[PDB]
Swiss-Prot record, chains A, B:
Residues 1-301 are cytoplasmic. Inhibited by pyridone-containing alpha-ketoamides compounds 13a and 13b. In turn, alpha-ketoamide 13b (tert-butyl (1-((S)-1-(((S)-4-(benzylamino)-3,4-dioxo-1-((S)-2-oxopyrrolidin-3-yl)butan-2-yl)amino)-3-cyclopropyl-1-oxopropan-2-yl)-2-oxo-1,2-dihydropyridin-3-yl)carbamate) inhibits SARS-CoV-2 replication in human lung cells. Inhibited ex vivo by michael acceptor inhibitor N3. Inhibited ex vivo by compound 11a and 11b. There is a cross-link at K3, K88 (Glycyl lysine isopeptide (Lys-Gly) (interchain with G-Cter in ubiquitin)). This is 3C-like proteinase nsp5. Signal peptide: none annotated. The active site is at H39 (for 3cl-pro activity), C143 (for 3cl-pro activity). Cleaves the C-terminus of replicase polyprotein at 11 sites. Recognizes substrates containing the core sequence [ILMVF]-Q-|-[SGACN]. Cleaves and inactivates human TRMT1, preventing tRNA guanine(26)-dimethylation of tRNAs. May cleave human NLRP1 in lung epithelial cells, thereby activating the NLRP1 inflammasome pathway. May cleave human GSDMD, triggering alternative GSDME-mediated epithelial cell death upon activation of the NLRP1 inflammasome, which may enhance the release interleukins 1B, 6, 16 and 18. Also able to bind an ADP-ribose-1''-phosphate (ADRP). Residues 1-301 form the Peptidase C30 domain. It catalyses: TSAVLQ-|-SGFRK-NH2 and SGVTFQ-|-GKFKK the two peptides corresponding to the two self-cleavage sites of the SARS 3C-like proteinase are the two most reactive peptide substrates. The enzyme exhibits a strong preference for substrates containing Gln at P1 position and Leu at P2 position. The lineage of its organism: Viruses, Riboviria, Orthornavirae, Pisuviricota, Pisoniviricetes. It comes from the Viruses. It is found in: Host cytoplasm; Host Golgi apparatus; Host nucleus.
């Protein structure tokens, strides 16, 4: 078991370089449209509080250098959708895959194809934190890189990277340009909320642990949703809905451990720590595997 | 910072399904040759101790079902190179990339494109353990999947997956069919050696930590290669050569921390533990990032 990302080829053929002035960042090229963050048009003079409708008026199609590999794309149109710029180009990407644009939920995971200058550099798995940040690995110029899921031959695009928040975490939008969370594409004082722990994900990781022969933390007891949740709010774990229990049905059925039985096991580790013990090679509780990531890794989808 | 894998598209176009009898596993299709493990030809009757030259004699080209996606490939030849079967087919893979075949060293890392039935399912980063095993995430039928590095446009193939060892770790070969380590493609009692810790890699991960503002473990002292190594053999850490120090030159120069200064810091954490503290979100010392992985992740190659 291990953090595992989707194969990235379907998405690598879509990454291009977008230049605007002396600003360079990554774009996503689907059919005849290049999606990139709209802060590409900011100059260092306007970053504190840019007027984007105004900044974009001063721009002309030929201020926008789009490069696919080493081919140069002809920008025949430019418009702004929320925080995303849509650059209409004259070629449709021959490598465009079947795709949809999805807004994901806090707790859900995706792969990230980290790019610089339109070239991929790496792929890794992320979760959307409950406070709508992502704990990424992104450098300067990683802007425009995308997060995605692949359900056989269909790429669901769900995240486009925009900024680092000075706290070291990352903020971005869906592919329609709406930020995840309260954040703005502006160099301004911005705070993420307090960041909680995705309980349903920690429970799935415990199931993965049991599936892989690591079972020391399994215990006697049961408990209820109500009583476990009330311990859960004390360690800043997210409330466990009844749907979360239902989402864990396949995992529970595969191990013979009922959901509330595993909760009772988790409730103990919260009040007691792991006391020098590991679980799946880790001394803390992991919360960035969904129950699907765990079923998928243990079913070889 | 994070375990980060190479973009996998160049390798996804090379994965095919190879069937032989009722055995199904993955093959690697480069130009007109499909590489796959030779244990594809084993029946459950011969697995305890197969005679492979003899088993292969009984086989004919048309016992070998090779499928590329849903295209069927015509096998016009079959031969055995060490533990690898080379199936000559009549089509050259149109998607063949620039590639070399490399045998890597214990300690070195690579990405794995985990496949089943010739279709990719996920990509993750691995290290070759000093005992020539890999701590993988592989299920039944993951045989034939490959490990690789990408140095701009050149895929270096370095690992092909063969078996799980009952201890839960994984064993395989280079693309010339020679096993890493003492292992044999035979259902027989096999033991990996005692598994040590890649010291040069742990030092690089400490540098990554310092580069990312996490510095609590940095200390006063220095030490020497000789004196640190002598603490190092006590915690089953690998000996630190002088080349390892030289390999750490770029990292040391970027942080202003000399190599032996960082060693003195590591020597303390060995004798004292992390005492509830984390480093880069981890409560143990990571040893599966090379100094290049750390420079690459902190330079955006
Ligand atoms: C104009 C605006 C919206 C303020 C902005 C400014 C810079 C960038 N950053 C570009 O690297 C970059 C590259 N090309 C254009 N911007 C980086 C970024 O967020 N620093 C923020 C850090 C402190 C708060 C102000 C900006 C970045 C670093 C690491 C990983 N991810 C992104 C992103 C957005
Ligand atoms: C014939 C030979 C060499 C003994 C062999 C037998 C089975 C396989 N395994 C196939 O899954 C598989 C699929 N198609 C053909 N074999 C699996 C495997 O290693 N079990 C070993 C476990 C105990 C020791 C005997 C075999 C496997 C599981 C998980 C991840 N990786 C591989 C590999 C090699």
């Amino acid at each position: 078991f291990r953090k595992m990302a989707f194969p990235s080829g379907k998405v690598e053929g879509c990454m291009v370089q977008v230049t605007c002035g002396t600003t360079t960042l990554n774009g996503l090229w689907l059919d005849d449209v290049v999606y990139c963050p709209r802060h590409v048009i900011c100059t260092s003079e306007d970053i504190l509080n840019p007027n984007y409708e105004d900044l974009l008026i001063r721009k002309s199609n030929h201020n926008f250098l789009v490069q696919a590999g080493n081919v140069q794309l002809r920008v025949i149109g430019h418009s702004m959708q929320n925080c995303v710029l849509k650059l209409k180009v004259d070629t449709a990407n021959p490598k465009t895959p079947k795709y949809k644009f999805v807004r994901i939920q806090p707790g859900q995971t995706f792969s990230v194809l980290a790019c610089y200058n339109g070239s991929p550099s790496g792929v890794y798995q992320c979760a959307m934190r409950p406070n709508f940040t992502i704990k990424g690995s992104f450098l300067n110029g990683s802007c425009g890189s995308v997060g995605f899921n692949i359900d056989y031959d269909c790429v669901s695009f769900c995240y486009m990277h925009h900024m680092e928040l000075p706290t070291g975490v990352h903020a971005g939008t869906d592919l329609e340009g709406n930020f995840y969370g309260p954040f703005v594409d502006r160099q301004t004082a911005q705070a993420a909320g307090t960041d909680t722990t995705i309980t349903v994900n920690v429970l799935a990781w415990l199931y993965a642990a049991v599936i892989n022969g690591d079972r020391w933390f399994l215990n006697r007891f049961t408990t209820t949703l109500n009583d476990f949740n009330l311990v859960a709010m004390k360690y800043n774990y997210e409330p466990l809905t009844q749907d979360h229990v239902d989402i864990l049905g396949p995992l529970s059925a595969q191990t013979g451990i009922a959901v509330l039985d595993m909760c009772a096991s988790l409730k103990e580790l919260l009040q007691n720590g792991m006391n020098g013990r590991t679980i799946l090679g880790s001394a803390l509780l992991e919360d960035e595997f969904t129950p699907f990531d765990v079923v998928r890794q243990c079913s070889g989808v």
